[PDB]
Each structure stands twice: as structure tokens, then as C-alpha cells.
């Protein structure tokens, strides 16, 4: 016992709210509404939320508060046969830190590259431009924009890389930005919750300040309604399709990050008798609500572009870093008071990624701080090694061909691993741990048992909801490419090793412990499905 708790229950909520609100809320949800029938897309997004994402989100943080231990220790202390789950979850979290923090670094570079009276991603008469430039976007291939070239030819310096092998020099401005990233990560996560729960007040709330400013700015623009018209006009015929439900179900999963070990880690500091059920419902609503608001912030500006700049919206309604690093920064260069919005937009993108990153790296520390008592004794001088490890390798993500390395891990490092990882978390609870065993745990703290709805969701719907994704994920697998670059045969292979390096540790303990405990087989299977308290 005697494990420190959140200084204030707000410190917890802001910590989890900041985690689940990332750039996917900004660069993937509103594109998905656009791509998949406007307001009609909300139904499968709302269904998959209610039956899939929310019951899984509810789960991972109910386990945190209850078993009061970090991810690995937690999973070992309730089903030892599948203790390998906890490891893989942290391995996935481990790999993610190598590439996710780059998006923070990129936004940071754009941040103090905007301290001037005229932004540089507007013209095409610069040293790094191309005769194939255009003022704005277009539905043509090899004729990129003015910001599509500033991003590639100046910021990333990517055009000087012939592939994954050629990585060229190290963009040292970028490395300092990535240094600044992990540095403010360290000075926010070393002294424990007493500061992490405090820092998140800036990182979780600053986006909503900025989001409101650009929500006010975007709707007050010529053609702003046109973008909202593109955002929410319903085409229910999309519901009759099948890829929409996959697009919806997938976003709900990754826009909520359940089972990643982070909600477990964050919630493992709640007081025992805390109304987690009210927490999970509130936080997860704020998440989807932020995506909705953000979508208005994006398409208000998107519509302004098709009305005052003459661009086919299908050439600007995009997803991923193309939206937040090229498309949106190109429009705010036009509107007056430019240098303001740019500086606040990029710091919003920074505060969107930082609090989301904290939870991943905190899930790693909290995982083994409970399993390895050597760690918790001197933690400040643990993470300084982990982040320097994150930084040194992160110099690869700062090289000329560094994006090619980013794109690999985004598609492989946690793309399928955490999908089948959580899938075993759901089965390890709904059948091995048991709903009956699990319900009274929740009844003990929050006072009442989970209704029959959360039980049926945890038992039947959520697993097929996961296979619903993983089935479609694999059939939709093609060899990894980017633009006209096809990653080599071994490049695909190494990624599958990165992805497999986590899942492989699930049976690699289900067999290690299965042969390291004595007795019969049925005795071993029965002695290995008995929790810690008992």
C-alpha cells in the first residue's frame, strides 16, 4: 500500500483528456466525416463509440484504479498466463515514442519559424522552389503547392533522399526541436504526478483556447459555411456501405487509445472508491466533442479556400500531417493578422501532441516502476536515460530522409500490434478474469455493478469489433509505399518484426510460465488462471 495519488481529481481528468485528444482529432476525424457522408458518418462513428470504443475505454481505466498497479504488474497480478500482455503493451508504447514525438518537433519548428512579418510558405520565388510550383493545391500529381514544397524542400529536406537507405545529413535545427520536445517532457515527468498532473493544465487546456480562437476566426470568413456544408451534409448511402464502418470503428479505437497501458497507468493513481464510471463517460465525450469542434475549425478555413482562392476542395480536404502542416498553414497566410494564427496554431499542435505523448511515456515508467522496485527508488535518473535513448535514435527522425523512417513506424510499429494486444486484454477479462469476477470489483469502489449493457459489450460486441478492424486491416495491407517510393522487400520485413516483437511476447510468456510452474497440465492451467489477491 501507500502509493501516491492525484493531487486533485482534475489533475487526473486533464491528464487523460489531454492524452486522448491528439492530432487525429484534428487531421483524421473531420476528413472522415467529409470522406464518408458528412453527418451520416456520425452514426457508425457514434455506434462504434457506444458499443466498441467507450466500453473498452471504460475498461482499461477501471482496471487501473482497481488493481492500483502498473500495466505489467497489473496484468501479471490478475491472469499470470497472459502476463506477456503487459510487456507487449509497454513495448508498443516504447516504440511509439521514437516517432510520435517528431510531430511535436515539426510543429515546434514551424512555431519559431513563424516569428517574422511575412510567413515563408507562401511564395515560390525562393532558393528551394521548383518550376513546377503552384500558389495553392491542385488535383495534379507532380505540380505541388507553395507549402508542399516548403515542407519537403526546406523543412524536411526530404528531396535529397533516394529512399530509406539514403538518409543524408542531420537537420540540426530539427534535432534541437526534438531535443526541446523531450526536454520539456523530462521537466514535466520526473518529479512524478505532483508536476505531470499540473503541466497537463497547460497542454490539455491551451488547445481549447486556441481551438475557440480559430473557431471564431474560421466561421467569420468568406465561404466559411461552404466548408461546414462539405463537413456535415448527409449522404446516408454511406451507411449502407462497409468501409465506412471500418473507417468509423478504426478512428474510435485510436482516437481513444484504450488498452495502450496509459489509462491503466493514469488510473492506477486514483483513489480506490472513485466514480470511474463518471470519469470514463465524461472524458471520452470531451474527446469526441473536441473532434467535432475541431472539424468546424478545419472546414471553416477549408471552405474559405474554395471560395476566395479557387481550389477544388477534394485537393485540400485531406488527412494526416498534410492537413496541419501544409493545407491549413497555407490558408492562414492569406488572411490578415497571419503571424498571430500561425503561432497559436502550431503551439496548439504542440500541446495536442505533448499531453498525448506524456501518457505513453508515463505508462512505460509506471508499468515497471511497480514491477522493478529499483526503478521507483531513483526515477529522475531513469527517464533521463530512456529519453536520451529516445533522443539518439530520434536523430534518425531528424535526418534528410527522416520522414521515410517516421512513416514506417506509423504503419508498423503500433499499427496491428496494439490491435491484437487489446484483443487479448478483452478476452483475458471477459472469459479468463470473468465478468462476474470483474463486476463486483467495480461494485466495490463505485458502489454499483456495471449494467448488463457493459457486460454484453465487453463479452460479445467488443471482441468482434476488434476483429472487425483487424480482418479489414490485413486485407487492406499492401507493401509500404510513399508517393513514388516503394519500400524495399526487407523494409516491410523489419516492420513486421517491430510489430511482431510485441505480440510474440504474449505466448513467449504463456509458454515460459507454463513450463516454469510445477504440476500437471490441468493443475498448471488452473494454477495460472488464479489472480494475485487470492
Amino acid at each position, epitope marked *: 500500500d501507500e502509493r501516491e495519488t492525484w493531487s486533485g481529481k482534475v489533475d487526473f481528468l486533464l491528464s487523460v483528456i489531454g492524452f486522448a485528444v491528439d492530432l487525429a482529432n484534428v487531421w483524421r476525424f473531420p476528413y472522415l466525416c467529409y470522406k464518408n457522408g458528412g453527418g451520416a458518418f456520425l452514426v457508425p462513428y457514434g455506434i462504434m463509440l457506444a458499443v466498441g470504443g467507450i466500453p473498452l475505454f471504460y475498461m482499461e481505466l477501471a482496471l487501473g484504479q482497481h488493481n492500483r498497479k502498473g500495466a505489467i504488474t497489473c496484468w501479471g497480478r490478475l491472469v499470470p498466463l497472459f502476463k506477456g500482455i503487459g510487456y507487449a503493451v509497454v513495448l508498443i508504447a516504447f516504440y511509439v515514442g521514437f516517432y510520435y514525438n517528431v510531430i511535436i518537433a515539426w510543429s515546434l519548428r514551424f512555431f519559431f519559424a513563424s516569428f517574422t512579418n511575412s510567413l515563408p510558405w507562401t511564395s515560390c520565388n525562393n532558393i528551394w522552389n521548383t518550376p513546377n510550383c503552384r500558389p495553392f493545391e491542385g488535383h495534379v500529381e507532380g505540380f505541388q503547392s507553395a507549402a508542399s514544397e516548403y515542407f519537403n524542400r526546406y523543412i524536411l529536406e526530404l528531396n535529397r533522399s533516394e529512399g530509406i537507405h539514403d538518409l543524408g545529413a542531420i537537420k540540426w535545427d530539427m534535432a534541437l526541436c526534438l531535443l526541446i520536445v523531450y526536454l520539456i517532457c523530462y521537466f514535466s515527468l520526473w518529479k512524478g504526478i505532483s508536476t505531470s498532473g499540473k503541466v497537463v493544465w497547460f497542454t490539455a487546456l491551451f488547445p481549447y483556447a486556441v481551438l475557440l480562437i480559430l473557431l471564431i476566426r474560421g466561421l467569420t470568413l468568406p465561404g466559411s459555411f461552404l466548408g461546414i456544408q462539405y463537413y456535415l451534409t448527409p449522404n446516408f448511402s454511406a451507411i449502407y456501405k462497409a468501409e465506412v464502418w471500418v473507417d468509423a470503428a478504426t478512428q474510435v479505437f485510436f482516437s481513444l487509445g484504450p488498452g495502450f497501458g496509459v489509462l491503466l497507468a493514469y488510473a492506477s493513481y486514483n483513489k480506490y472508491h472513485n466514480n470511474v464510471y463518471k470519469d470514463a463517460l465524461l472524458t471520452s465525450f470531451i474527446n469526441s466533442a473536441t473532434s467535432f469542434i475541431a472539424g468546424f475549425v478545419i472546414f471553416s478555413v477549408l471552405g474559405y479556400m474554395a471560395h476566395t482562392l479557387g481550389v477544388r476542395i477534394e485537393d485540400v480536404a485531406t488527412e494526416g500531417p498534410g492537413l496541419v502542416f501544409v493545407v491549413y498553414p497555407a490558408a492562414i497566410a492569406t488572411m490578415p493578422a497571419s503571424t498571430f494564427w500561425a503561432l497559436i496554431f502550431f503551439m496548439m499542435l504542440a500541446t495536442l501532441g505533448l499531453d498525448s505523448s506524456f501518457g505513453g511515456m508515463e505508462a512505460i515508467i509506471t508499468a515497471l516502476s511497480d514491477e522493478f522496485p529499483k526503478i521507483k527508488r531513483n526515477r529522475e535518473l531513469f527517464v533521463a536515460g530512456l529519453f536520451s535513448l529516445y533522443f539518439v535514435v530520434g536523430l534518425a527522425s531528424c535526418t534528410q530522409g527522416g520522414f521515410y523512417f517516421f512513416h514506417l513506424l506509423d504503419r508498423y510499429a503500433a499499427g496491428y500490434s496494439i490491435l491484437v494486444a487489446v484483443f487479448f486484454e478483452a478476452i483475458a477479462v471477459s472469459w479468463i478474469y470473468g465478468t462476474n469476477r470483474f463486476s*463486483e470489483d467495480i*461494485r466495490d469502489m463505485i*458502489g*454499483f455493478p456495471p449494467g448488463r449493457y457493459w457486460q454484453v459489450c465487453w463479452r460479445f460486441v467488443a471482441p468482434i469489433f476488434l476483429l472487425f478492424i483487424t480482418v479489414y486491416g490485413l486485407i487492406g495491407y499492401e507493401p509500404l509505399t510513399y508517393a513514388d517510393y516503394v519500400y524495399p522487400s526487407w523494409a516491410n520485413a523489419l516492420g513486421w518484426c517491430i510489430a511482431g516483437s510485441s505480440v510474440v511476447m504474449i505466448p513467449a510468456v504463456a509458454i515460459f510460465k507454463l513450463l516454469s510452474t510445477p504440476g500437471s497440465l490441468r493443475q498448471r492451467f488452473t494454477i495460472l488462471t488464479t489472480p494475485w489477491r487470492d
Partner: antibody
Amino acid sequence: EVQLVESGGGLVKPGGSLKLSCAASGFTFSSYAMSWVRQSPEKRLEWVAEISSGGRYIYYSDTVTGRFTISRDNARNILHLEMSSLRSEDTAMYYCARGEVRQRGFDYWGQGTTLTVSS
Amino acid sequence: ENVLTQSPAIMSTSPGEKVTMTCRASSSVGSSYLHWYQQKSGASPKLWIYSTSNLASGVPARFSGSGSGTSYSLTISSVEAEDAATYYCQQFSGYPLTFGSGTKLEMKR
């Protein structure tokens, strides 16, 4: 159609020992936390023990802890309370009360069985 | 141990009165964990009001619950003669669970 019915109960000498049992029908007994509440002959309601829906968390009264032992088995639909080191002030009518949700209290109460601890 | 103290012990009322009985507490109690029970003579109790104000099935709407913090109350709009019983308050905030001193409703004549 829910029913609780207590049993056992009778005269016992101080320091004695006795086991009371409650039979439950009309509902799925294996999914509702049960509690023993006794009320003295002076009509003072006093809680004794709570047992989980699966008996995994158990809370005792400070005045019975160690002397009293609550237990249940759900295949048989019976809830038990064994007493030992019985003192005189343990005399009461012992109620078997179904109370799963804390925020809603004890739904159904049995008819109660009487226990006397006297020399 | 958080002790609940009901008052009055005996309440003499005739059918038609507005009667209100209280249940003070030694320590603050969540508005959702306070309950009331009615116990007729020679019978087992019955859940009358849960979570301060919400009455159970069969409980006539002439009954009402209010109060919060460390001071709660039970109120009957218009007493009926069948309401002659003993009313207990009970708390689920923290263990050990405690009941109230009870208010016995007795009829006037």
C-alpha cells in the same frame, strides 16, 4: 417473486457458537451482494456483515469482527453466518438483506430468525 | 463510526397532518447513499426511500425525501392511518454501515 428466508437461530450460552443460514429464491442469487443486519430486542437496527456477489470482498462490524464469519455458496443459493465466542449482546433478530447497489440500499429483507445468548 | 441520530423517537400524529422526521449524522454522507426504511409492527423492514429522495415501488407519492450533508429528513404530505410504523434511516457512505435511531409514528386519539 423474490424471497429471503432465514434459519438456524435459538438459545445459546455465552461463549457458545451457532450458524444461521438464509435461503434465496425468486432471483439469481449469484449476482446480488447480501448482508446480515440484526436488530436488538430494543428495536435497534445494527449491521453485522456484507458479503460480495461472489464473496470476494467482505466487511465486518467492529463488534463481531473475528467472532463472526459470513459466507455464501451460490450453487445452493444459501447465505451463511457462523457465530463463535458468542456474547450476550449478540442477541437479536437476524435479517438477511439483499443489497447489491450501495446507492439503492437493501432491496428485499427476509422474515428474520431469532437468537438468544443467555446463561 | 458515523452514527445517525433520528428525531423524534415517538411522533404522535393523526391522519391528515404534515409530519417531518429528521436524521442528523455524525459525519457527512453522500446524497446517493442515504436510505430510509419503514418497519411495521411484527414485520421485517422495507426499503422506503433510496438515495435521499427516490422512493421504492408501492411507496405512495405522499412520501418525500430531502436534506443533504449531515442533516436529512423524511416528510409525509398527508399522513394516512396505515403510515403508523417505525421509520429508520441508513447510510452506505462508508463502513461500518449504520442505521438511524428510528422514529415511531403513533396515531393520535
